[PDB]
Amino acid sequence: PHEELQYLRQLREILCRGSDRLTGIGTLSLFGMQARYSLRDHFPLLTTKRVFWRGVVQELLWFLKGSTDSRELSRTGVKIWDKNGSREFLAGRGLAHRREGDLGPVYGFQWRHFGAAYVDADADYTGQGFDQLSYIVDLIKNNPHDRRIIMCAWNPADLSLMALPPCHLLCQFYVADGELSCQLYQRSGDMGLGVPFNIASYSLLTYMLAHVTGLRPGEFIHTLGDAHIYKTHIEPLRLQLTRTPRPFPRLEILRSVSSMEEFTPDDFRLVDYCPHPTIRM
Amino acid sequence: PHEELQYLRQLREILCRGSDRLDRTGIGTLSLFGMQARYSLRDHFPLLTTKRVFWRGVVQELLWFLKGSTDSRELSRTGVKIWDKNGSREFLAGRGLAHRREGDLGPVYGFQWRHFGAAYVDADADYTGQGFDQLSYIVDLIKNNPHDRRIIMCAWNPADLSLMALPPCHLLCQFYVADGELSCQLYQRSGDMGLGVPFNIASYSLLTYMLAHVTGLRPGEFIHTLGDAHIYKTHIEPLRLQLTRTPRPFPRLEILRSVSSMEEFTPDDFRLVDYCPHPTI
Ligand SMILES: Cc1nc(=O)c2cc(CN(C)c3ccc(C(=O)N[C@@H](CCC(=O)O)C(=O)O)s3)ccc2[nH]1
Ligand SMILES: Cc1nc(=O)c2cc(CN(C)c3ccc(C(=O)N[C@@H](CCC(=O)O)C(=O)O)s3)ccc2[nH]1
Ligand SMILES: O=c1ccn([C@H]2C[C@H](O)[C@@H](COP(=O)(O)O)O2)c(=O)[nH]1
Ligand SMILES: O=c1ccn([C@H]2C[C@H](O)[C@@H](COP(=O)(O)O)O2)c(=O)[nH]1
């Protein structure tokens, strides 16, 4: 039974039993969902519609950098954070005095410098705040059965400095039988666009962490809070609800990388990815 | 089907195929990673019946949390001693926390809920207007923007971990409103299925009843998401016994008078009817 059917059943449920609720734009939604994806023999990149894999990779490395600069992601060809880094959008957020591309203390800053005072995207933060990436990497290496291997992006005190508050709040990691697993808690999930993307991101993070630590990829567990469908997306989502999953691709890591920071997009080969055609939403 | 059978199934799964691990202090647990159970709050209250749950503790401890107290001496005064061991002068010394008055647990749940991001100095100090008051934040959201997808309270603060007596188990809870009902999901990084988890279920269910009462809504669903779900090997025998017990119907919870603020609840506003658990083990 294909694991992608979990995602497809969740879609089907939200569309059929979801709550119909409206500030700006309207959605169908359910609350509390969990799905499991094996990482042992394949990589759970959804096949019912093509997922922007190039975006997935560039954005994770950009996160892992600690960068909060939407321009630096943009330079690589990935424009998904650009609407949010415009001086116009920032102004609308009451953050007008930002330079272009300064998103505030978003994921990268929270992952590498939690609790630090944010100044701007160009400030040097070395040795400031709590480095969560170094923290979990050390625990996975030297104390793998620890129950506190967590990386959290939710920092309520920093919300008003943020262009957009984080959706995927925290990940926890788990080690058993030489396998590295990961649970992601996502407060909010757009099933039409974000959620396939998000599944891929944290699955990737786990492959990367597994590699760097000498472990094999295990399970990725996806726990949603608000799982929702935007109503404008209903006829394209019914389209994808008709399609049968193709087998998952595999993910190869093309070289020895000793540090989470030394990865490059060319270290990853996506083998045998054959999605159905892209659906625009 | 009776909801407690979710918990008991989880017990059995862990006992049957759980992973046999040791910590770096040598103690053995069986554990599994990634679990979710749903408990209805509408017609009843999910206080577990196959073993008696310390309900007096549940109530006093939560009221204690909601006040922002990080003083174990205060909870202990009520006759509830569950945090006394962690508050002892010797425990804190064992943690490497000198200059600590007895009962000073550090920036734990209460401090995080009320003053997230604030500079902790001590349990007696006064933090008014320091940090981010998450409790007011969520009560406000549930009242004035119930469909917000960021109705979050979080206790995981990486920067404060070395200052805490114990690191938080309940990382965060999220709330959700639909069709006149308040719902809640909790992310728990670590659950002792033997002692902690029944208690923990009662705690956040109770919190949801209180929030529902204060905001003019009916208790909806409580979703319980776990990370490391485990059983200490020493308790396997009493748990075998527990698993033979047939669950009895859940009690109910009546809130006596009208309470207008989350801070004005007293242990007396709560009527538990009728809790008839199998004998304690
Ligand atoms: C309403 C909303 N839903 C989302 O899913 C969402 C996601 C992000 C960030 N994110 C995690 C994204 C992942 C993928 C994206 C995207 O734009 N994909 C395009 C592909 C672009 C292209 O043509 O190359 C798409 O397929 O529409 S955006 C930001 C705001 C959002 N807003
Ligand atoms: C290893 C471990 N497991 C736990 O479950 C745990 C729980 C807490 C805090 N906690 C969340 C607790 C919930 C319930 C508790 C308890 O001891 N209840 C007693 C009541 C004692 C009495 O009635 O006098 C009991 O149920 O027997 S303690 C602290 C450390 C822990 N440590
Ligand atoms: O990584 C992401 C980022 C955003 N979103 C979606 C979820 C919501 O539909 C919207 C964010 O809006 P709020 O939930 O923050 O209001 O974008 C995702 O699914 N994944
Ligand atoms: O509210 C609580 C507090 C603690 N624990 C348990 C979980 C673990 O067995 C232990 C905490 O140890 P660590 O997870 O921190 O190692 O206590 C709970 O189940 N619930």
Author numbering:
A (entry chain B): 51 to 72, 75 to 333
B (entry chain A): 51 to 331
What does the paper say about this structure?
It catalyzes the transfer of a methylene group from the cofactor 5,10-methylenetetrahydrofolate (mTHF) to its substrate 2′-deoxyuridine-5′-monophosphate (dUMP) and produces thymidine-5′-monophosphate (dTMP) and dihydrofolate (DHF). KSHV encodes functional thymidylate synthase (kTS), which shares 70% sequence identity with hTS. The overall structure of kTS was found to have a similar structural conformation to hTS, except minor differences in ligand binding site and conformational variations in some amino acids.
The ternary kTS structure were determined by soaking apo kTS crystals with dUMP and raltitrexed since co-crystallization of kTS protein with ligands was unsuccessful. For the ternary kTS structure, an excellent density map of the ligands was observed except for the glutamate tail of raltitrexed. The ternary complex of kTS had an open conformation in which the catalytic Cys219 residue did not form a covalent bond with dUMP, which was also observed in rTS. The raltitrexed molecule was observed to bind to kTS at the active site by interactions with Phe104, Ile132, Asp242, Gly246, Phe249, Tyr282, and dUMP. There were less hydrophobic interactions with raltitrexed in kTS than in hTS. The Trp109 residue in hTS was found to interact with C7, C9, and CP1 of the raltitrexed molecule; the corresponding Trp133 residue in kTS did not interact with raltitrexed and was rotated about 60° away from raltitrexed. The distance between the Cα atoms of Tyr282 and Ile132 which were located at ligand binding site of kTS ternary complex was 18.8 Å, whereas the corresponding distance was 17.8 Å in hTS. C-terminal disorder might contribute to the open conformation in ternary kTS and rTS. Although the C-terminal region did not make crystal contacts with other symmetry-related molecules, we could not exclude the possibility that ternary kTS structure was not able to adopt a closed conformation due to the crystal lattice which may impede conformational changes to a closed conformation.
